[PDB]
Amino acid sequence: KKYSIGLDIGTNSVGWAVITDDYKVPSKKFKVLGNTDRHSIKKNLIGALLFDSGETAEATRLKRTARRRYTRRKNRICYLQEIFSNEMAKVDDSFFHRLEESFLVEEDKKHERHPIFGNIVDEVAYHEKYPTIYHLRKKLVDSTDKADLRLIYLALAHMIKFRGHFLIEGDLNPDNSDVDKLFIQLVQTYNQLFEENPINASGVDAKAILSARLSKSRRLENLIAQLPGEKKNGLFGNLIALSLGLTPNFKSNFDLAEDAKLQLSKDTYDDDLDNLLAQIGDQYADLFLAAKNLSDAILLSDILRVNTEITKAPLSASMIKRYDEHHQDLTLLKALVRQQLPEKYKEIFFDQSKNGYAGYIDGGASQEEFYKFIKPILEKMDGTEELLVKLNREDLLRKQRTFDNGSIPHQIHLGELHAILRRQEDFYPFLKDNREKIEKILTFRIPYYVGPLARGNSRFAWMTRKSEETITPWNFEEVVDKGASAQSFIERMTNFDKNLPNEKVLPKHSLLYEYFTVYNELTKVKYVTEGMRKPAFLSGEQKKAIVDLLFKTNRKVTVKQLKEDYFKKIECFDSVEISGVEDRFNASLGTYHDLLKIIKDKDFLDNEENEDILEDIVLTLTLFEDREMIEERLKTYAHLFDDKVMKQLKRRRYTGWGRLSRKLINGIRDKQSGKTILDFLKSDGFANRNFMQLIHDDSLTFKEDIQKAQVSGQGDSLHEHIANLAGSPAIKKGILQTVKVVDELVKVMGRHKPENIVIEMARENQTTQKGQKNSRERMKRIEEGIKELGSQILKEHPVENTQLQNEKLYLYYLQNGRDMYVDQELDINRLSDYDVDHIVPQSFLKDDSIDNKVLTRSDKNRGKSDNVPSEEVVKKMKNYWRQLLNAKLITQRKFDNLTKAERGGLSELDKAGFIKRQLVETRQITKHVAQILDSRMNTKYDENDKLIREVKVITLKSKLVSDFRKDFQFYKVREINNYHHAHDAYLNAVVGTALIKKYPKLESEFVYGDYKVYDVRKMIAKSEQEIGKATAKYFFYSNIMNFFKTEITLANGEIRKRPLIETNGETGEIVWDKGRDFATVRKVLSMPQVNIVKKTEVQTGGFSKESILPKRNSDKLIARKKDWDPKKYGGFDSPTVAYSVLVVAKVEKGKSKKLKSVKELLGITIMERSSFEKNPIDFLEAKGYKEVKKDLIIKLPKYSLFELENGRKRMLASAGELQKGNELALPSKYVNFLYLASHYEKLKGSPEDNEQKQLFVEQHKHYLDEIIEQISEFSKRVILADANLDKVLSAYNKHRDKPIREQAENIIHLFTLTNLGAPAAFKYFDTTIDRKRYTSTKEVLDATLIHQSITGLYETRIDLSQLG
């Protein structure tokens, strides 16, 4: 029996469905193992797999680099200790012992209690003499006599634990820390970028303004008062705002759509930065990095304030000034509270829980939480002056170890470290011998290229050594083979190309990559001179002239400079309209002008010979951060550069990688001309194409040349092949699970192979479903359109974005309160009867977009033509359409649709576009899933060199199943049950197999393979309908989805009815029996039994929650080490159980401790899983279970499905918490009713069938009572929430008279009582009803366990009541 398989791949769900010739899903009685008495289960071969998302690996990368940096810092401490240890054991015996056990309670601490100095008196005298350690450090720098050695160790160990960022390289010269130089560098960057409105910073004094003692905003406005003025909300003003620490809002500077706020000091800055950089172009990231390092320079000069007593400790003196002003303001504020507010003193200084001062010190409360707290009750009091100006400058009661010490460079710690080491070297000869040793412990950063210092056992390392001993920071130079380490770093940290693998990509600022992107923009610019009326693209010598003339002169060139310097200056044309570029050229030769202002030689860069030199230079700057391996990978290029540009060009940095590789741009060539991609984009002749066309051209060799390399990038194993894909690990989990499903499923069906695997996959979405992130850019389009045209509409009828989900209102605003058909005013009160109108109709392609839908009064103000309406319409409205297009309300696509009849009509290429935009699919990952499945399922070669492609793995889009779903009323409601994955898979199978039977002539467009090059020039008619049963054309009506219909409602009201029983043209076989196939499909979407499987995974992840919870007398806590009992030290809480195993053994029960037989569901945490699987009955004997039976242990992970009495299914979720394992099947009439009634206003169609469906809503009001009857008859069986069901029945009875739209949306909210998984709380009309949790786990162990397979067709039903 031939069959097919439909697949719906998602991030959290794989839907799989098996169909036959007659479109029924099969029905196959399945054997069931185990020991229950049901020996055969009938199951439908439709279902889905449900699995929680594949989490990406970067959380582990964060935790792993944190583990590494903690281990490196501990080893820096151990290096300093193994230095000091000899003469420390001369001075104090167990000092390092006492610092090692400083954490312990006095009983566990096997020495004296005081870490420093031993006994009681000397530790007290130490803390009185040095209240912080910055006093100690500011003493040891600023002294000449000797100091105690363990006290010097405390100083130096505090230096080399907490040592500050390495981010600036060299020393603290004023070129990277004096903020005059940083601010003038920002001004140089800004004038280098814009050059129109260039700001002039000649007379500003950025040091004494941006660094002086003031509040932050007052510090800001003085600076804009200095320069002649941009704004306090301009780009440079908001950029200084970013540089000071307070949040600017950049949506007004670049005029974006959404609100984008960038605070520098947040812990989520540099992701808000790059997803702002996605909207603005990446020519600004240098401006924002200049903002950031100016901010660190300002904030460094904000910590460091001691400059008069300049004696060698600019940090420690600053922090003891902050200690002393903290102390004097504490005494001031304590005396001032007890003066003026005798209440709210215990609530301020004894509080420890309410953001007061005792919450700011003893408790856990922030700085700015404390300032939000204490700004009212210091605004209130009487004499409070200079305790509010140092709150608006954030400096009253400020700590030392704050969050802002992430800007101290390591050279400051190095400077006062150097000072401690050479004040003490005279008294201790021990340190005169090791001072370079100490400073090398401090200033040693394992570089990027070296990586983890492993000795073979890592998975992550590429250290290759020039010796064999222990790598300490002393001998890092004479152990690490840095050339070979850098080479292995390059081959680890390059990136492979997507459409030409086994190849390294270019860097993102590669010079030929910028030539590539300038040509990829200039291939689509078309110019119309005065007197030809034919838009022609640029030729070869014209492109050569403009690239050699203006791109190599100015960085970004707009259309004004384009026409001014080329058509006005060279071509001597007064005005030539320019099509493809809106305002500025999006591509720019940023690397070219950067290198031109670096090495000061245009003639060197105009040579074609130096491109390997320049690309090696850009690759060196892209890969490496380090000064040494950039100066040594440029010592090869010191031959050409006169040693002052070399100290200038080594400063230059880049990041990121280009999308393409060099063997793909200037690499592979065409056999007919020998031209590369760059050579085509220079001189293509008359017809200039772009890069995506050059790789999607079956005429040219280039797609086949990509196919030459795509054979090589395929591992023999499945998992490495899927790892080779491009996408999230969630969607790759989905791809791997659907391949598991395909292999398991073809194992089901007689071990045969299918005839088709049909695939759709629309996932990895981060568009927020376009509910609220869209309406802002909708109003943006409206308002800048009214800005450009100049005719006011929202001076007459304004509507905010709360109502702009209505499509007819948006279409009212975009045509300026007029009609694009007849010069009319759209009546606003009577918009309810004004019908929704397409331009390219619903019989040419299914679309619901603004570029296809328009609004007008009548049905046929349009015309009578099935194309874009007649020439009388478009010539008369040609005045108004240009006026409305030049304001940008509507797309150039929709203008070209409304100017498609003036050029004759729909061409062959036009309908070819209309069938490409519904049938082929452009995202790469769907093509790669099809590649996986036809490479695994079609495997038999033959006597020739061709794979006999038996199983045609075929690709849908989503819109085909979407309009088969909406148009024929197979309505989808996600919130009812999880069957919609499987019903979407079934409709995938139906639409795919029906399109492959009715249209085998188009299998060269949406099945993976290399089929015929016979395009669609012959399968669409050049005129109207062809002859019967001998038509070489497929369908002249360019919509593909028509043959499912009966009526074909045109744009002229006609029902051009297609035959009832569809047949194929090429063979005369029936493809679609309209009388019973929709009966079959609507019966399949009413299956009550659909194989929903929750994938029982073992929880891999963290050991527990990681908030370290304080000293509590509970048992629930986890010890942080093996000798730190949480009853005295505290520790983590809530261990994650990896799998809840079962124990049937004997405990000592009762007062006589009888070995009573028990069956308990023990929980095995992740901390204890390895010790469990070492010897499980040994651990269960250790736990308190006796005579444990090793065969009688059954592993139950999370989502382990049970089944209890009366068909109650409950999936395990913890050691003692269950979930709802039952699905709620609902017949398709009820689901159609709930989708129509819950979309009772937003139908978005012509009002004829909307009146039809609205009458279908209003007549079947009995369905709401039937649905609540059904949910009650369900929840009295498999949910058993008695009180919750009675609450929702009473709340249903109270709101029975409410309208159908609100009542329908609240019954779709009401379905959360019966969904799969965890119980939830859900809002029915006002009764926000509390959930019920299923914590009874003693009802589980008497009930049937089911071991479902990966599709659920194979069950091994273990009964647990049969055990002891």
Partner 1 sequence: MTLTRAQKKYAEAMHEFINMVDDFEESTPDFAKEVLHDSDYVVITKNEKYAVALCSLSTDECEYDTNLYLDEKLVDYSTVDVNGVTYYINIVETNDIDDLEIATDEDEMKSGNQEIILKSELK
Partner RNA sequence: GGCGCAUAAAGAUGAGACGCGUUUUAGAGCUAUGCUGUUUUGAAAAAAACAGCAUAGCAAGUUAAAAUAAGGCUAGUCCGUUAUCAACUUGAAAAAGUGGCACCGAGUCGGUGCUU
Give the active site residues: 8, 838
715 binds RNA (CB under 7 A): no
**Amino acid making up residue 1254:** Q
59 binds partner 1 (CB under 8 A): yes
* Count of beta carbons in the 10 Å neighbourhood of residue 49: 27
Which stretches of 738-811 are assigned E, i.e. beta strand?
756-760
278 binds partner 1 (CB under 8 A): no
If DSSP codes are grouped into helix, strand and coil, which group holds residue 99?
helix
282 binds, options partner 1, RNA, none, Cβ within 5 to 8 A by partner type: none
Q: Where are the alpha helices (DSSP H) in 700-842?
A: 702-710, 718-723, 729-748, 775-789, 807-814
701 binds RNA (CB under 7 A): no
Nearest one of 518, 570, 568, 529 to 549, comparing CA atoms: 570
**Beta-carbon contacts of residue 264 (< 8 Å; ≥ 6 apart):** 242, 243, 245, 291, 292, 295
The residues in 1205-1234 that bind partner 1, with binding defined as CB under 8 A, are 1214-1217
872 binds, options RNA, partner 1, none, Cβ within 5 to 8 A by partner type: none
Least separation in angstroms between residue 741's CB and partner 1 is 25
State residue 1173 phi and psi, 5-degree precision: -75, -5
Query: Contact with RNA (CB under 7 A): which of 82, 87, 93, 100?
Result: 100
Chain CA centroid to CA 337, Å: 50
55 binds partner 1 (CB under 8 A): yes
**Beta-carbon contacts of residue 211 (< 8 Å; ≥ 6 apart):** 179, 298, 301, 302
1134 binds partner 1 (CB under 8 A): yes
If DSSP codes are grouped into helix, strand and coil, which group holds residue 469?
coil
Phi-psi region of 847 (alpha: psi -120 to 50; beta: other; left: phi over 0): beta
Measure the CA dihedral 424/429/431/433, to 10°. Answer: 140
- Dihedral sign for Cα 579, 581, 582, 584, please: negative
The residues in 1089-1108 that bind partner 1, with binding defined as CB under 8 A, are 1102, 1105-1108
Which is nearer to RNA, 81 or 610 (by Cβ)?
81
The interface region with RNA, picked from 9-17, 241-249, 846-854, 1041-1049 by CB under 7 A, is: 846-854
The residues in 227-256 that bind partner 1, with binding defined as CB under 8 A, are 246-247, 249
The interface region with RNA, picked from 8-16, 125-133, 599-607, 676-684 by CB under 7 A, is: 125-133
Which is nearer to RNA, 123 or 1302 (by Cβ)?
123
The interface region with partner 1, picked from 51-59, 1031-1039, 1117-1125, 1291-1299 by CB under 8 A, is: 51-59
The interface region with partner 1, picked from 102-110, 127-135, 265-273, 1355-1363 by CB under 8 A, is: 265-273
772 binds, options RNA, partner 1, none, Cβ within 5 to 8 A by partner type: partner 1
* HSE, side-chain direction, 13 A CA sphere, residue 792: 5
The interface region with RNA, picked from 41-49, 184-192, 1156-1164, 1295-1303 by CB under 7 A, is: 41-49
471 binds RNA (CB under 7 A): yes
The interface region with partner 1, picked from 225-233, 261-269, 701-709, 787-795 by CB under 8 A, is: 261-269
If DSSP codes are grouped into helix, strand and coil, which group holds residue 194?
coil
The interface region with partner 1, picked from 185-193, 257-265, 437-445, 665-673 by CB under 8 A, is: 257-265
1283 binds, options partner 1, RNA, none, Cβ within 5 to 8 A by partner type: partner 1
Q: What is the largest CA-CA distance in the chain?
A: 111
Q: If you search the block for the tokens 């004499």, which residue do you land on?
A: 383
Least separation in angstroms between residue 1119's CB and RNA is 6
The residues in 1092-1111 that bind RNA, with binding defined as CB under 7 A, are 1095-1098, 1100-1104, 1106-1111
Query: Contact with partner 1 (CB under 8 A): which of 56, 200, 339, 707?
Result: 56
457 binds partner 1 (CB under 8 A): no
115 binds RNA (CB under 7 A): yes
**Beta-carbon contacts of residue 1067 (< 8 Å; ≥ 6 apart):** none
Which is nearer to partner 1, 283 or 801 (by Cβ)?
801
44 binds RNA (CB under 7 A): yes
Long-range contacts of 1018-1024 (CB under 8 A, 24+ apart): 1020/908, 1020/911, 1020/912, 1020/915, 1022/908
| Number of residues near RNA (by CB under 7 A) | 231
Give CA–CA dist 373/876, Å, rounded. Answer: 68
Least separation in angstroms between residue 262's CB and partner 1 is 10
The residues in 61-80 that bind partner 1, with binding defined as CB under 8 A, are 61-62
Measure the CA dihedral 1352/1354/1360/1364, to 10°. Answer: -150
Give CA–CA dist 261/263, Å, rounded. Answer: 6
**Beta-carbon contacts of residue 1161 (< 8 Å; ≥ 6 apart):** 1140, 1141, 1142, 1143, 1196, 1215, 1216, 1337, 1340, 1341
The residues in 520-559 that bind RNA, with binding defined as CB under 7 A, are 524
x/- track of binding to RNA for residues 1061-1090 (CB under 7 A): ----------------------x---xxxx
If DSSP codes are grouped into helix, strand and coil, which group holds residue 907?
coil
Q: Structure tokens of 584? A: 């500025």
| Number of residues near partner 1 (by CB under 8 A) | 51
Q: Structure tokens of 1008? A: 């993976």
Q: Which residues pair with 409 in a beta bridge?
A: 165
Give CA–CA dist 790/826, Å, rounded. Answer: 19
Give CA–CA dist 812/835, Å, rounded. Answer: 12
Give CA–CA dist 652/590, Å, rounded. Answer: 13
The residues in 877-936 that bind RNA, with binding defined as CB under 7 A, are 891-893, 896, 913, 917, 922-924
x/- track of binding to partner 1 for residues 355-374 (CB under 8 A): -----------x--x--x--
Least separation in angstroms between residue 507's CB and RNA is 12
Least separation in angstroms between residue 150's CB and RNA is 11
Q: Structure tokens of 384? A: 């409070």
The interface region with partner 1, picked from 165-173, 268-276, 292-300, 436-444 by CB under 8 A, is: 268-276
Q: Are 1041 and 846 in contact (CB under 8 A)?
A: yes
* DSSP conformation class of 281: -
Q: If you search the block for the tokens 């300032």, which residue do you land on?
A: 371
Chain CA centroid to CA 934, Å: 30
Least separation in angstroms between residue 769's CB and partner 1 is 11
102 binds RNA (CB under 7 A): yes
Which is nearer to partner 1, 744 or 1342 (by Cβ)?
1342
Give CA–CA dist 635/647, Å, rounded. Answer: 12
The residues in 355-394 that bind RNA, with binding defined as CB under 7 A, are 357-358, 361-362, 364
372 binds, options RNA, partner 1, none, Cβ within 5 to 8 A by partner type: partner 1
The residues in 1302-1321 that bind partner 1, with binding defined as CB under 8 A, are 1319, 1321
625 binds partner 1 (CB under 8 A): no
**Amino acid making up residue 994:** A
Q: Are 518 and 511 in contact (CB under 8 A)?
A: no
68 binds, options RNA, partner 1, none, Cβ within 5 to 8 A by partner type: RNA
Least separation in angstroms between residue 1282's CB and partner 1 is 8
Which is nearer to RNA, 206 or 932 (by Cβ)?
932
74 binds RNA (CB under 7 A): yes
544 binds, options partner 1, RNA, none, Cβ within 5 to 8 A by partner type: none
Q: For binding to partner 1 (CB under 8 A), which residues are involved?
A: 55-56, 58-59, 61-62, 246-247, 249, 258-259, 261, 263, 266-268, 270-272, 366, 369, 372, 768, 772, 776, 1102, 1105-1108, 1116, 1134, 1214-1217, 1280, 1283, 1319, 1321, 1326, 1328, 1330-1336, 1338-1339
